[PDB]
Design an enzyme around this catalytic site. Structure first.
Site, mmCIF file in Angstrom:
data_model
loop_
_atom_site.group_PDB
_atom_site.id
_atom_site.type_symbol
_atom_site.label_atom_id
_atom_site.label_comp_id
_atom_site.label_asym_id
_atom_site.label_seq_id
_atom_site.Cartn_x
_atom_site.Cartn_y
_atom_site.Cartn_z
ATOM 1 N N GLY A 259 0.794 -1.209 0.000
ATOM 2 C CA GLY A 259 0.000 0.000 0.000
ATOM 3 C C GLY A 259 0.832 1.267 0.000
ATOM 4 N N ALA A 260 1.887 1.306 0.808
ATOM 5 C CA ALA A 260 2.737 2.480 0.921
ATOM 6 C C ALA A 260 3.927 2.109 1.780
ATOM 7 C CB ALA A 260 1.986 3.685 1.496
ATOM 8 N N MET A 261 4.893 3.029 1.875
ATOM 9 C CA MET A 261 6.146 2.742 2.567
ATOM 10 C C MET A 261 6.747 4.005 3.169
ATOM 11 S SD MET A 261 8.344 0.525 3.489
ATOM 12 C CE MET A 261 9.702 1.063 4.574
ATOM 13 N N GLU A 262 7.164 3.889 4.436
ATOM 14 C CA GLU A 262 7.561 5.016 5.279
ATOM 15 C C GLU A 262 9.022 5.448 5.118
ATOM 16 O OE1 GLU A 262 6.719 1.892 6.448
ATOM 17 O OE2 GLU A 262 8.056 1.299 8.121
ATOM 18 N N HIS A 295 -0.897 6.413 8.645
ATOM 19 C CA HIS A 295 -0.016 5.291 8.991
ATOM 20 C C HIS A 295 1.439 5.592 8.644
ATOM 21 C CE1 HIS A 295 0.631 0.864 9.601
ATOM 22 N NE2 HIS A 295 1.629 1.094 8.755
ATOM 23 N N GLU A 296 1.687 5.993 7.398
ATOM 24 C CA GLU A 296 3.059 6.227 6.960
ATOM 25 C C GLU A 296 3.669 7.399 7.705
ATOM 26 O OE1 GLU A 296 4.391 3.934 5.436
ATOM 27 O OE2 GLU A 296 2.543 2.841 4.844
ATOM 28 N N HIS A 299 4.701 6.337 11.253
ATOM 29 C CA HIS A 299 5.952 5.575 11.268
ATOM 30 C C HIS A 299 7.174 6.448 11.488
ATOM 31 C CE1 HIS A 299 5.243 1.341 10.542
ATOM 32 N NE2 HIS A 299 4.635 1.520 9.377
ATOM 33 N N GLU A 318 4.733 -2.131 13.596
ATOM 34 C CA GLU A 318 3.473 -2.234 12.843
ATOM 35 C C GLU A 318 2.244 -2.295 13.744
ATOM 36 O OE1 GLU A 318 3.507 -1.387 9.998
ATOM 37 O OE2 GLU A 318 5.600 -1.701 9.391
HETATM 38 N N1 LIG Z 1 6.292 -0.748 6.598
HETATM 39 C C1 LIG Z 1 5.305 -0.926 5.459
HETATM 40 C C2 LIG Z 1 5.383 -2.384 4.997
HETATM 41 C C3 LIG Z 1 4.476 -2.696 3.801
HETATM 42 C C4 LIG Z 1 3.067 -3.015 4.243
HETATM 43 C C5 LIG Z 1 2.583 -4.320 4.208
HETATM 44 C C6 LIG Z 1 1.290 -4.605 4.617
HETATM 45 C C7 LIG Z 1 0.447 -3.584 5.030
HETATM 46 C C8 LIG Z 1 0.910 -2.263 5.077
HETATM 47 C C9 LIG Z 1 -0.031 -1.177 5.477
HETATM 48 C C10 LIG Z 1 -0.772 -1.260 6.652
HETATM 49 C C11 LIG Z 1 -1.628 -0.238 7.027
HETATM 50 C C12 LIG Z 1 -1.753 0.876 6.243
HETATM 51 C C13 LIG Z 1 -1.057 0.960 5.057
HETATM 52 C C14 LIG Z 1 -0.210 -0.060 4.670
HETATM 53 C C15 LIG Z 1 2.232 -1.989 4.693
HETATM 54 C C16 LIG Z 1 2.838 -0.573 4.804
HETATM 55 C C17 LIG Z 1 3.902 -0.381 5.865
HETATM 56 O O1 LIG Z 1 4.035 1.002 6.130
HETATM 57 O O2 LIG Z 1 3.591 -1.031 7.067
HETATM 58 ZN ZN LIG Z 2 3.383 0.082 8.652
#
Ligand SMILES: [NH3+][C@H]1CCc2cccc(-c3ccccc3)c2CC1(O)O
Ligand SMILES: [Zn+2]
Ligand SMILES: [Cl-]
Ligand SMILES: [Cl-]
Ligand SMILES: [Cl-]
Ligand SMILES: [Cl-]
Ligand code: NA
Ligand code: NA
Ligand code: NA
Ligand code: NA
Ligand code: NA
Ligand code: NA
Ligand code: NA
Ligand code: NA
Ligand code: NA
EC number: 3.4.11.2
Length: 868
Positions: A259-262, A295-296, A299, A318
């Site tokens: 979905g996205a990455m911090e 979320h991002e 982080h 997480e």
């Molecule tokens: N560190 C990353 C790892 C990748 C990942 C994998 C599975 C779910 C999610 C995610 C959860 C909640 C909201 C948006 C994305 C993410 C994003 C992340 O930011 O946790």
């Molecule tokens: Zn995350």
């Protein structure tokens, strides 16, 4: 030849640290040349070699203090360098090929842009490095590229240098002052429109905000920008945390496994969680953008300023960051709807994982492929565990714990245990027993029996707990379960909880296999509300009467309890009617159950947001968790029959409430969203009314909609009820939207989850659709993933055709994009929940995959557990 499992108990500090790394990228899609100059320090024994991780790298040279090195060897996944001094400069030059990177791990192409994904272990696909999150280095990144093709060259931090070169190339150098693990490295190169704004922190720091999107998309970026500012303000107000750099970049990319990455100061987002316009995006999309932006952002402290000592500690960032995003969404929006939907996810998706062959504690003990552990358990159950700490401590103590956690661990790579210790130390609440939640997998079952003694005016709860064994753990022990209750008298008034002349806290500490809680001064028999606000992530066994449950629907103080009581009431009759379906008998439902939902429709004092969720039936995946053996065809056909029965019994009330909640103005505002969710909850039932009324109502809403929420609700209803207008509306949508992949994902989901008899034939044919491609994870998830995961009735067709289809798709994806393949295989891993004939076909499918040439470790781990 497959990788060996790694174990949490084998953690050992690194023999070498890298304190500073200077990277140069000479960028090209076919060939990128990476130069990495690292300042290293030995911490281990003087005779220990430096073991660098690397995958699919072409090594050009190795120097130590500018001396070409001879004491090295390459081995599988590694470069092993011997005979080193205690401190030295390592220089590696190697080549990589972004255009060949279909797995979207490391440096790869997204359309014409170049971008990275390094979590969990992607940086080793870029250069040879200590690709482990307890190695924290200060990065400087110099990017050289063709100026016309790549006018924007981005990495973490601040721009510290820039220049132009011959032959149309240019370069930019970035410096990120905060030491980081390499999974937080990012690089982006491309041509973008940029939305630019500013946030001023509460202490006066002006932060430049930059959202990079594909050319032409600036008018789809303001909501994400607004959500970023909202996230920044909330983290100040609620947690006292300010951003720590003077630049916050977000890049939206179309090709992204997650979905996205911090990545620090340079987040990279799937476009799905950035782009929004009201004609193309739904209310849900808007609130998901808010959640994911939040979320991002969150982080930045819970993950970046404090990171993870090792990947078994993933939930440290997480679970805590999911808790933060839930609290953000809940504070800004409807807390009850947020809580309800997070509980739906826990009970209907995470519980299933926790009984499956992939079950793991929120802090895993054993991992083969770490990217397989970005799970419902680590995230959503992780957040429930944080929330239990919050329940046990209260907000003030919880924030004291946050403050102590950052004071101790800012700038380091910490553990789950460190976090619990900070909470315990700051609050003086003993969390020693509580820690078992980190170590034990599976869902506890809490059984409650009660007794009212009129002679003594005492009410006694006898509460038991057990966790069934799971495939990963033969030993289970009692947990510290915070068990929240409320007691109601005959008039719906709360009965004060007390014993022996003293108040008793409403959060009961259920710490034993069996215990007894006695309450005094209970003058009338109570109706209990139990496990209030889903106060622990457990299954509750209590022998409710229907009338206790409808009483709670009318009188419970917390909106969540009213919804939860409705769920318990439905569960009884879902189970009844699945058993009836299996014996060829039609739906049976007592009148007084329909009347409870009639009362919700007609109650003018209920929040529309809550009414809408009470009127949203459990999904087929939520329903499955009610059963020892899943019959997915019975479940799907009972869900439809229940919908039809309620539609007939409540036809007049449904239409009245549908009309009453009409809104001519469209606004992304929580009160309007709630009215729309109620209106469209009614539409779902009305779609199963008399065919001609339903067809007219649904097609009118589709054609008159001034926003995608209402248009998609109508389209979804036409598909769900197989209405006459369905094919015309689906074709109209395709003709209007086929060039917009995010919008077509909604259409692929509807196709994949259709009740039509020919759904698999349609899904197969859509592999050739103009808007579909196997190169795009979003398209894959929306068509193939939705079929296998969200249409279990068709996926589990008794002829086995759904399993064979998924094997075909996974045979491709195993080679192309193993991370997406591993998400898609999950429905097959659940085979032991199904009848014997289905198990046989699912095992055969898994054995075919087990025999693939070049089986990925991602799939190997899951196949091995499923076939055990
Ligand atoms: N560190 C990353 C790892 C990748 C990942 C994998 C599975 C779910 C999610 C995610 C959860 C909640 C909201 C948006 C994305 C993410 C994003 C992340 O930011 O946790
Ligand atoms: Zn995350
Ligand atoms: Cl090129
Ligand atoms: Cl974009
Ligand atoms: Cl529904
Ligand atoms: Cl079949
Ligand atoms: Na040196
Ligand atoms: Na709120
Ligand atoms: Na791996
Ligand atoms: Na991998
Ligand atoms: Na009893
Ligand atoms: Na009872
Ligand atoms: Na209380
Ligand atoms: Na106790
Ligand atoms: Na196509």
């Amino acid at each position: 030849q497959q990788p060996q499992a790694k174990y949490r108990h084998d953690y050992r500090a690194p023999d070498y640290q890298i304190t500073d790394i200077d990277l140069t990228f000479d960028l090209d899609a076919q060939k990128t040349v990476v130069t990495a100059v690292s300042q290293a320090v030995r911490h281990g024994a003087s005779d220990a070699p430096l073991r660098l991780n690397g995958e699919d790298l072409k090594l050009v040279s190795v120097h130590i203090n500018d001396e070409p090195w001879t004491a090295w060897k390459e081995e599988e996944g590694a470069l092993v360098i011997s005979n080193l001094p205690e401190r030295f400069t390592l220089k590696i030059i190697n080549e990589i090929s972004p255009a060949a990177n279909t797995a979207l791990e490391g440096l790869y192409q997204s359309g014409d842009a170049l971008c990275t994904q390094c979590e969990a272990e992607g940086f080793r696909h870029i250069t040879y490095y200590l690709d482990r999150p307890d190695v924290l280095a200060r990065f400087t990144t110099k990017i050289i590229a063709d100026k016309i093709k790549y006018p924007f060259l981005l990495s973490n931090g601040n721009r510290v240098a820039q220049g132009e070169l011959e032959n149309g190339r240019h370069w930019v150098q970035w410096q990120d002052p905060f030491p980081k693990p390499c999974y937080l490295f990012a690089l982006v190169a491309g041509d973008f429109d940029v939305l630019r704004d500013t946030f001023t922190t509460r202490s006066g720091r002006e932060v430049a905000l930059e959202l990079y999107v594909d050319r032409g998309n600036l008018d789809r970026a303001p909501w994400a920008m607004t959500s970023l500012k909202n996230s920044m303000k909330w983290d100040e107000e609620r947690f006292g945390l300010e951003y720590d750099l003077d630049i916050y970049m977000i890049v939206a990319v179309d090709f992204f496994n997650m979905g996205a990455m911090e990545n620090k100061g340079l987040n990279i987002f799937n476009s799905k969680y950035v782009l929004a316009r009201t004609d193309t995006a739904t209310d849900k999309d808007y609130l998901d953008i808010e959640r994911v932006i939040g979320h991002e952002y969150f982080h930045n402290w819970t993950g970046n300023r404090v990171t993870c000592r090792d990947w078994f500690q993933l939930s440290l960032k997480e679970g805590l960051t999911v808790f933060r995003d839930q609290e953000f969404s809940s504070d800004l929006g409807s807390r009850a709807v947020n809580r309800i939907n997070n509980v739906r996810t826990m009970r209907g998706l995470q519980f299933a994982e926790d009984a499956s062959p992939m079950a793991h504690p929120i802090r895993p003990d054993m991992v083969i492929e770490m990217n397989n552990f970005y799970t419902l358990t680590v995230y959503e159950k992780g957040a429930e565990v944080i929330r239990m700490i919050h329940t046990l401590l209260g907000e003030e103590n919880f924030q004291k714990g946050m403050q102590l956690y950052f004071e101790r661990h800012d700038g380091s790579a910490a553990t789950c245990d460190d976090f619990v210790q900070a909470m315990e130390d700051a609050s003086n609440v003993d969390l020693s027993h509580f820690r078992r939640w980190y170590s034990q997998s599976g869902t506890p079952i809490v059984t409650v029996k009660d007794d009212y003694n009129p002679e003594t005016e005492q009410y006694t709860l006898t509460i038991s707990q057990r966790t069934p064994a799971t495939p990963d753990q033969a030993e289970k022990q009692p947990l510290h379960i915070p068990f929240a209750i409320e007691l109601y008298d005959n008039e719906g008034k709360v009965i004060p909880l007390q014993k022996g002349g003293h108040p008793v806290n409403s959060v009961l500490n259920v710490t034993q296999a069996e215990q007894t809680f006695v309450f005094d001064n209970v003058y009338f028999q109570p109706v209990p509300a139990l496990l209030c606000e889903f106060s622990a992530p457990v299954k509750l066994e209590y022998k409710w009467s229907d009338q206790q449950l409808t009483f709670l629907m009318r009188h419970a103080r917390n909106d969540f309890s009213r919804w939860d009581a409705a769920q318990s009431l439905l569960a009884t009759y879902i189970k009844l009617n699945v058993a009836r379906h299996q014996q060829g008998q039609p739906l049976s439902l007592p009148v007084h159950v329909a009347d409870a939902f009639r009362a919700v429709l007609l109650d003018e004092k209920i929040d529309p947001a809550l009414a809408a969720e009470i009127l949203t039936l459990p999904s087929v995946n939520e329903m499955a968790e009610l059963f020892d053996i899943i019959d997915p065809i019975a479940i799907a056909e009972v869900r439809e029959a229940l919908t039809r029965t309620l539609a007939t019994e409540l036809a007049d009330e449904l239409l009245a409430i549908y009309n009453a909640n009409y809104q001519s103005e469209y606004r992304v505002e929580h009160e309007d969203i709630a009215k729309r969710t109620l209106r469209n909850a009614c539409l779902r039932f009305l779609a199963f009314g008399e065919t001609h009324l339903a067809d007219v109502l649904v097609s009118k809403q589709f054609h008159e909609a001034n926003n995608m929420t209402d248009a998609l609700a109508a389209l979804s209803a036409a598909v769900a009820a197989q209405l006459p207008c369905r094919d015309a509306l689906m074709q109209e949508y395709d003709d209007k939207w086929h060039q917009n992949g995010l919008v077509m994902d909604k259409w692929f989901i509807l196709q994949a989850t259709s009740p039509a008899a020919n759904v698999l034939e349609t899904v197969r044919g859509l592999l050739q659709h103009r808007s579909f491609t196997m190169s795009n994870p979003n398209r894959i998830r929306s068509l193939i993933g939705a079929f296998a995961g969200s249409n279990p009735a068709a996926f589990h067709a008794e002829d086995g055709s759904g399993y064979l289809f998924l094997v075909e798709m996974l045979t491709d994806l195993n080679s192309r994009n193993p991370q997406v393949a591993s998400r898609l295989i999950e429905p097959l891993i659940r085979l032991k929940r199904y009848d014997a004939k289905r198990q046989e076909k699912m095992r055969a499918a898994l054995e075919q995959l087990k025999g693939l040439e070049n089986l990925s470790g991602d799939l190997y781990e899951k196949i091995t557990k499923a076939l055990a």
